[PDB]
Symmetry: D2
């Protein structure tokens, strides 16, 4: 498929695997919002 070039691309070292999964959820959250930006104004 090859996705287009999105915004920049940084990284973050999250210590502790427990809190790691927690941050991952927040990442996907904002990710879906960005995809809803190109969606209808509704």
């Amino acid at each position: 498929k090859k996705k287009p070039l999105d915004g920049e691309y940084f990284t973050l070292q999250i210590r502790g695997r427990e809190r790691f999964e927690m941050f991952r959820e927040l990442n996907e959250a904002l990710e879906l919002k960005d995809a809803q930006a190109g969606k209808e104004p509704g």
Copy 2:
């Protein structure tokens, strides 16, 4: 000092510089509470 056994160490790609600073903030947030887990709750 600091911590004997360090937890795992993963990483996360944060697209977008604006949202990046947002996640980094939460990172130090949880890290602070971790240092408070040393002395019992008071």
Copy 3:
């Protein structure tokens, strides 16, 4: 439509107007994923 059984309904006092808008953003974030829990993951 929307959702048959609504989950519980609590509340939270957010001190500071600046940080307030920050939490509200995460609120709608999780709410969006909840609506996606209807159709299987794809």
Copy 4:
């Protein structure tokens, strides 16, 4: 003691008890850093 001028005070309806405990955790997180804003960064 504590803080002279308290910031504003709003509220937020968190649907779902599971996600509720999640937001509450981040609440105390930012509150802790606020108390550290007293002494310069070190």
